[PDB]
């Protein structure tokens, strides 16, 4: 087995510790949240005697039943971590009611006021931390409730996470945020981009501020192009239908990749305090004109020739004579000194020859004196499937060598949930990985342009095979935007 | 067992090519010189109908005994390769004779003219290169000789190699230079030093020139402070009173690690030409003052308390009251404006802890927004015992952290010398060989200090043989600006 080897420093061991998971019947809740709590459990990332309740809509009088039929059902490590479930779940309680009404909220109140005063400790205010697993709509009516009905007492904060999406467009985006206002401030809101909780995401700051090699190589006089990649072999599966309202763009590029450019492009911080990372992520994004119609390239996939995929239009659930893109490659300019001329693209797709999500920084040649005989540095970090981050330069060919120009291409390769860590994150304060409700503006800015072009039909997709690369159009872009496939 | 597929081009199948090794008794031609031969021959880089003369005093009336219990003792790769042992020693002849006589040198000639004639072509003008394994004292003597009765016939060309050393000090080793200069010019002559044959060594221009990563760091605003160590386990082994004569800093650091560090410090050459790249060893080398005596830590190697490797004066050959350093860390300083102020630091030492040599750069910290979170980024390409390079770079712990600070260091790491010489030698590419103004301003760095060593001026510091070396030595390279990882 294993002893739990308590991680949380001592004072955050003080006060009662409650974490409401609304909607902890949906599947996020299960799938996600609470196996991301459990894997925090067996960590000891978690106070000796928190609390965890599940809110829910749906009454079940399992409560002791539902709690190891259904919850167990989705977890993760049982042939390691099998001794701790019990204890886990010792600390896990139900709560049924709705998510939008105030008295709903005072009874949980005081249901989770008698837990706070069942803690060992003189003090009984107890932190109060709201997971959010609820669609969109749900998430005004339920902060609403919550500080009207569930407030901590006097001393211990209260957090709220909540995840995307936040809107679909510019406009969507800040009225969501518009509605949240009222309730609780940017002190208070954790927004989850699960991409944040990546390791590989996580070390971009590190490696590129930690380290005078990265540091001093970092900027538009070295750098000749840099690419952002999300690929899978998969297609819509079936669910044509939810993904052609959010297309490709919206899934995983205004967010998942546009996060990641921030941390690869921002100016460095001046200390690793929290809101100094995300004023330079909102001070990069700042620099960045929204994308026209001349820097994309979108694409629809087709059949897979094998039959395995079938073609996105061949989904009766998706309208027919659909613009929307399950592929897009975009360009970026980002106006400011260290990148100004560097080219930054964007790409992703669905049902491409490979899964591969990774970042490619491409270096200037060094023309002389080697020539033809060198080839551009490149920096490469990949997240998924495997991580991993390598230098590819230019070497001596070994063995016996008739003159200098005989070179070879090599290699200096380096040698958790998500949820987990950002779920940790917060309950310690921390909000370095959460997106603060200015970045979300921003970030829409860039993107929302454009996307009301493809909507309005301004931009029809160029279609493509499952399993193969894309359309032409777009390497040939990728190629004319200043970058050297090799 | 193998075939041999012949690299060598048509040009070098035109005319005749014939290779006397002066000295075939000596340790090297049987240990160094011939092996490798035999290693061109193997990899098809000798061309059909090469001639290979074994020069020497020594007469063998058994001129084919001598291949095999001398010539061969030292061959390698006999498990794969032994299938052309003999066919290779059906191209190696014996000749007797003195280095400095001219008339022996004449017979020569006469004797490499039937070899020439009895060529398969037209041409029988035949090539010519003599690798002068001797001692010192005979360079001068074969040279005159070789220039006055065994130049080849007007259609072909002649290299002559020399060996270590080239003098003991800046005026020994000019009046070397001056007495070879009326027999040959400097495209002519091939001075070796072996580590500039080593893969590593040769692949610092390319690392360094054809990659923006490394050109774009490679200056003061991003380097603390360089080391280049040579390291050995083993002591003089009985020979000490050869050794006494010569000191760790002439054995290895003004030759070997001088040309590391030229080929590490200078500037980028116009084009890959051979003069090109030598003009900038020689261009960085003016940029070094002379070491003087407060640049310096010395060692004598005393018995390792191990049970063996004993001490350094308990060897009979060994003059008494020896100043002889067996250890020696210098710090050099390049004034120009690429290095200024940048530490560099020679260490070289035998019977120390292990076989090591490597160049480490130490880069300047990131002194913000980490701090003590951070550690120097170091670059280190090692030479022996295994050949690597490696980045060491500050990263995120692995797993759910507290904090970003919570960090740990990582690497990036990248995934014989003799045979490579004569072949470059060969193709007449003197790209890896010392030319005569490199071989006197890098004498001169070394030469005030050599002075004061022999004048007594320095003394050595005892340390056990196993050991790192004095401690006044790690506590000297603390004070010159370098953080131990
Ligand atoms: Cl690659
Ligand atoms: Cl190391």
């Given at each position: ?15 009662p510790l409650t974490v409401v998971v609304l909607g902890a019947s949906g599947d996020l809740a299960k799938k996600k949240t609470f196996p991301a709590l459990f894997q925090l459990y067996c960590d000891g990332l978690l106070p000796p ?109 209260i957090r709220v996470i909540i995840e995307k999406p936040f809107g679909h467009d510019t406009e969507s985006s800040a009225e969501l945020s518009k509605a949240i206002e009222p309730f609780f401030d940017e002190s208070q809101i954790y ?223 380096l040698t958790p949930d998500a949820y987990e860590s950002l779920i940790s994150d917060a309950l310690r304060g921390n909000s370095t990985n959460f997106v603060r409700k200015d970045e979300l503006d921003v970030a829409w800015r860039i ?40």
């Open positions: 087995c294993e002893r739990i080897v308590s991680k949380v420093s001592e004072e955050q061991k003080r006060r005697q928190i609390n965890i309740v599940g809110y829910a809509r749906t009454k079940q009088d399992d409560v002791e039943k539902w709690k190891h039929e259904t919850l167990t059902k989705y977890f993760s490590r049982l042939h390691e971590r099998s001794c701790h479930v019990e204890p886990f779940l010792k600390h896990v309680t139900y709560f049924t009611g709705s998510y939008d009404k105030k008295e709903d909220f005072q009874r949980l109140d005081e249901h989770v006021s008698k837990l706070e005063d069942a803690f060992d400790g003189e003090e009984k205010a107890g932190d109060r931390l709201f997971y959010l697993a609820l669609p969109p709509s749900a998430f005004a009516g339920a902060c609403g409730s919550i500080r009207a009905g569930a407030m901590p007492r006097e001393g211990g904060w927004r989850i981009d699960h991409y944040l909780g990546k390791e590989m995401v996580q070390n971009i700051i590190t490696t590129r501020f930690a380290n005078r090699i990265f540091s001093a190589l970092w900027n538009s006089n070295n750098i000749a192009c840099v690419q952002i990649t999300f690929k899978e072999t998969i297609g819509t599966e079936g669910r044509g239908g939810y993904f052609d309202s959010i297309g490709i763009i919206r899934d995983v590029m205004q967010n998942h990749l546009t996060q990641i450019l921030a941390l690869l492009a921002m100016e460095k911080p001046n200390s690793l305090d929290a809101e100094r990372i995300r004023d330079e992520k909102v001070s990069l994004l700042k620099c960045i004109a929204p994308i026209g119609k001349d820097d994309c390239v979108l694409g629809q996939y087709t059949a897979s020739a094998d039959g395995s995929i079938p073609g996105y239009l061949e989904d009766e659930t998706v309208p027919k004579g659909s613009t929307c893109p399950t592929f897009a490659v975009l360009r970026l300019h980002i106006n400011n000194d260290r990148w100004a001329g560097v080219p930054f693209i964007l790409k992703a797709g669905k049902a491409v020859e490979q899964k591969y999500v990774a970042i490619r920084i491409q270096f200037k040649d060094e023309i002389r004196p080697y020539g033809d005989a060198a080839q551009r540095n490149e920096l490469v970090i990949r997240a998924q499937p495997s991580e991993a981050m390598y230098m590819k330069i230019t070497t001596k060919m070994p063995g016996l060598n008739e003159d200098l120009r005989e070179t070879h291409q090599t290699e200096l390769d993107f929302t342009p454009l996307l009301h072009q493809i909507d309005k039909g301004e931009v029809k997709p160029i279609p493509y095979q499952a399993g193969t690369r894309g359309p032409k159009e777009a390497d040939d872009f990728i190629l004319n935007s200043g970058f050297k496939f090799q």
